[PDB]
Ligand binder design. Structure first.
Ligand code: SRM
Ligand code: SF4
Ligand SMILES: [K+]
Length: 456
């Protein structure tokens, strides 16, 4: 288990070739596993650091995790600056021993692809005239829970306020240090920032950050999210550049019979002008392709099976690694997802909603890596073949789904969804998502204040 520090998921084609070689020659699985934190993992390493270090990469006592950055903003010009800041924050946080791990993101509305509510610290970019001017700071997200332990809970991030760009690092440092000092000293299961905030209060924590940073937060500046999905396919960037986002199921890059995904990406890496961007949805963006190069790149991607069309449902589904490598796994996730979505696709067709999607995620155990606690429909592994079914999150990921059914099997899950998707297909309002529908229609009570109402 080796994971690389790769702020914003930006990796060069040179670095890619180096990791492709290592994966194929020096690991049991021979795969490259894109993670939902915009980096990659090797599984079953049989020297890694010298291979990484040789291409300018480093693997993270350090309680920091990969700093995320919106991968493919609609306003393409904004990426360079936001990425610059994600990289600066990442370096600024590099070694204060944190009570628990600390996760940070840089978000560019209207996209919440990085799933900000799953993180301790989030900087939402505010731009004027195509230039970043500052950030809205949101603090306190975290999804991990422990089965049947009402003292644990998933929590969304709280708005602190707006800060001019110049105060970014001072604020980042102040948040980290306040959490370091105030984090629960005894119990590690209560050490996370989400718990600290609930114990001392948002305003108390906010006031201390201002005191330490030497600033005063301005009121939050308007921002809205429209979705969390990647922009699969070609999108026009700046100049004559184009970005091709490839859907990679479970982010598992391996050569399969008749679908040489790994080799295909290697071939693209060899002729690609710019670099690649690993997304928070475990997909890959071939970024900065000149218009004149589109056809070449597309030919390889197409021939390799990297552009095989899937339904919008599959594009918006996610699972954590789980078995066979995860030692904490309770139920299958990555290995369960493909056939599970085959079933969901059937249900969507049956109800005439094949063109629609439901943000559906499966996490192997309550640690929550698959981010099911921010999905419209989330499955949380409880035992082999059994999961807790949660419903009621929303498309943009700002609401935690309450547990609907507990410790049930796939057939039981499918039957429940068949019923629910049917009602949704027929009773939903114009453009109303599944999660919002289950809440409006009274199928599940919403989670309004996680620390107090997540558990029944
Ligand atoms: C690969 C990934 C899932 C995926 O399919 O993409 C992953 C994989 C693992 N996570 Fe994670 N987590 C992944 C994102 C997250 C997320 C989602 C996110 O960050 O966007 C969370 C939920 C958010 C949160 O932290 O609240 C998550 C919460 C954890 C936790 C519970 C943390 C907690 O605060 O309680 C653990 C267990 C622990 O640390 O004790 C954990 C533990 C683990 C480990 C390393 C298991 C272990 O402790 O030995 C799992 C390795 C499985 C394997 O064999 O590869 N992982 N993990 C993601 C790696 C991200 C990365 O590059 O760093
Ligand atoms: S949610 Fe549980 S099973 Fe899945 S990768 Fe994380 S720790 Fe392992
Ligand atoms: K994916």
């Amino acid at each position: 288990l080796l994971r690389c520090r790769l702020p914003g998921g930006v990796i060069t084609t040179k670095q890619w070739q180096a990791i492709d070689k290592f994966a194929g020659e020096n690991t049991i699985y021979g795969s490259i596993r894109l993670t939902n934190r915009q980096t990659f993992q090797f599984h079953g390493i049989l020297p890694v650091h010298q291979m990484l270090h040789s291409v300018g990469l480093d693997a993270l006592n350090d309680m920091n995790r990969n700093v995320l950055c919106t991968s493919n903003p609609y306003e393409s010009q904004l990426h360079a600056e936001a990425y610059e800041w994600a990289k600066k924050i990442s370096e600024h946080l590099l070694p204060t021993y944190l009570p628990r791990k600390f996760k940070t993101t840089v978000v560019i509305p209207p996209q919440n692809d990085i799933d900000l509510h799953a993180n301790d610290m989030n900087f939402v970019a505010i731009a004027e005239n195509g230039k970043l001017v500052g950030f809205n700071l949101l603090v306190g997200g975290g999804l991990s829970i422990e089965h049947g332990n009402k003292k644990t809970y998933a929590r969304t991030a709280s708005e602190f306020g707006y800060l001019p760009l110049e105060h970014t690092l001072a604020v980042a440092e102040a948040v980290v240090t306040t959490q370091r000092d105030w984090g629960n000293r005894t119990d590690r299961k209560n050490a996370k920032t989400k718990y600290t905030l609930e114990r001392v209060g948002v305003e108390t924590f906010k006031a201390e950050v201002e005191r330490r940073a030497g600033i005063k937060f301005e009121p939050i500046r308007p921002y809205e999210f429209t979705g969390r999905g990647d922009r699969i396919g070609w999108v026009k960037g700046i100049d004559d550049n184009w970005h091709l986002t490839l859907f990679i199921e479970n982010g598992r890059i391996l050569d399969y019979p008749a679908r040489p995904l790994k080799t295909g990406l290697l071939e693209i890496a060899k002729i690609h002008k710019g670099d690649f961007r690993i997304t928070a949805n475990q997909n890959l963006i071939i970024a900065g392709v000149p218009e004149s190069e589109k056809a070449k790149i597309e030919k390889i991607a197409k021939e390799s099976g990297l552009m095989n069309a899937v339904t919008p449902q599959r594009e918006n589904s996610m699972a954590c690694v789980s078995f066979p490598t995860c030692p904490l796994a309770m139920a299958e996730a990555e290995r369960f997802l493909p056939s599970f979505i085959d079933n969901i696709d059937n249900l969507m067709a049956k109800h005439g909603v094949s063109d629609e999607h439901i943000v559906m995620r499966v996490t192997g155990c309550p640690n929550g890596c698959g981010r099911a606690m921010l999905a419209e429909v989330g499955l949380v592994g409880k035992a082999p073949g059994r999961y807790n079914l949660h419903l009621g999150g929303n498309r943009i990921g700002t609401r935690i789904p309450r547990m609907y059914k507990e410790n049930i099997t796939e057939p039981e899950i499918l039957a429940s969804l068949d019923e629910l998707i049917g009602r949704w297909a027929k009773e939903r309002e114009a453009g109303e998502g599944f999660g919002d529908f289950t809440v409006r229609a009274g199928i599940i009570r919403p989670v309004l204040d996680p620390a107090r109402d997540l558990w029944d």
